[PDB]
Amino acid sequence: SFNGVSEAELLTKTLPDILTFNLDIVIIGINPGLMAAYKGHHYPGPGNHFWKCLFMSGLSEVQLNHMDDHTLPGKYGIGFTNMVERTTPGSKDLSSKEFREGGRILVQKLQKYQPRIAVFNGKCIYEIFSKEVFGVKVKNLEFGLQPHKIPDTETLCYVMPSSSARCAQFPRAQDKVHYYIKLKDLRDQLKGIERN
DNA sequence: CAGCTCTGTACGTGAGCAGTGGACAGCT
DNA sequence: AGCTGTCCACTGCTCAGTACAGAGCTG
Ligand SMILES: O=c1[nH]cc(CO)c(=O)[nH]1
């Protein structure tokens, strides 16, 4: 029990999006974990690498935590949402129909607020997104920038290893910070390309 | 064959948990 | 000196996607 709160109550709770217009980066998670539904803030996981990586990469220049997520769009130009809204312990608990439904809601949200870069916090969710939205399944899907903008916009697609610490192939935040740094570089290259 | 899809399986860190016990002050 | 309770350092866990092999297919 999370301070008295049963796991049953948490499964029903949802995590509110934090979206505005003219954002640079929208961090797209998979779906709310237990701690996320409890706190009502994005990536509150004590082990989760998201915030540490936001700092080590200098995307935030100050060590923030989940409580500051609502202050991100104004200050740092970063917004939050997920592929699937339903709260589950994580990943494998969701169905294919749920993910693709989420993708529809997601691609819809993306072409509304249209940020500069749609950041997929997880390879898995982009595999589903790419196949559904772009009708394309590539043998060797790689991290980083993707060949397709979300339809009818100029929003780019950028994929990173999931900030979850369950990922054994990237054991530490140091092992993931590289993709955040190139995300920051991508952002800067886009701001400059526009300012020209 | 060879390719394609889907399922299951295995894998490293480090934060936080309960349990354990050593240090130690306040007693009698 | 012996007793004893609290405190706390430290223990030994557990647990928060991805790559890939192979099986069941199809071409
Ligand atoms: O990739 C991720 N990691 C963690 C979460 C939530 O805790 C999420 O939604 N997506």
Side-chain angles (χ1 to χ4, degrees), chain A residues 1-6 8 10-51 53-84 86-96 98-136 138 140-188 190-192 194-195:
Chain A
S1 64
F2 292 68
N3 190 25
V5 179
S6 62
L10 293 178
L11 294 177
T12 81
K13 298 191 63 179
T14 65
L15 181 61
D17 296 336
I18 306 181
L19 293 174
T20 70
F21 300 90
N22 312 285
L23 282 177
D24 295 325
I25 290 169
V26 171
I27 301 297
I28 303 170
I30 302 172
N31 91 294
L34 292 178
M35 192 80 268
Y38 182 92
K39 294 288 184 178
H41 295 278
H42 298 255
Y43 310 111
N48 206 280
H49 296 156
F50 169 77
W51 294 107
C53 288
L54 201 72
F55 175 54
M56 300 176 201
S57 61
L59 271 170
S60 70
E61 78 243 341
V62 189
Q63 180 59 75
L64 301 165
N65 59 339
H66 64 277
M67 274 178 288
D68 317 293
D69 60 346
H70 284 75
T71 77
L72 292 210
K75 300 178 187 175
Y76 304 97
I78 302 177
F80 292 98
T81 188
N82 299 325
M83 185 79 166
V84 179
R86 175 172 158 264
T87 295
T88 68
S91 236
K92 303 179 180 174
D93 315 325
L94 298 162
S95 75
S96 178
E98 281 178 327
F99 274 114
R100 286 176 295 168
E101 170 177 41
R104 185 188 90 244
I105 278 76
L106 176 59
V107 68
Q108 187 164 333
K109 285 182 181 174
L110 284 179
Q111 58 201 2
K112 172 183 182 179
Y113 298 95
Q114 53 189 25
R116 298 180 185 269
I117 322 168
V119 177
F120 289 81
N121 184 12
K123 207 168 201 168
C124 63
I125 53 185
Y126 183 86
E127 288 170 327
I128 306 171
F129 190 92
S130 185
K131 182 183 180 182
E132 179 194 2
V133 180
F134 306 119
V136 165
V138 166
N140 270 22
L141 180 77
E142 301 180 331
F143 294 107
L145 193 50
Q146 302 299 315
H148 306 89
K149 311 173 186 175
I150 80 107
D152 295 331
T153 74
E154 292 298 306
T155 304
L156 297 79
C157 293
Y158 189 82
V159 191
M160 310 196 310
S162 169
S163 55
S164 172
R166 191 182 300 275
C167 196
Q169 27 273 130
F170 302 94
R172 294 142 53 247
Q174 187 66 49
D175 304 314
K176 306 178 185 165
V177 68
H178 152 72
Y179 296 103
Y180 284 69
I181 292 170
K182 276 189 175 178
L183 170 59
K184 183 180 65 180
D185 290 343
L186 176 59
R187 175 196 63 176
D188 301 342
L190 289 180
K191 287 188 172 181
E194 185 189 18
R195 282 188 170 183

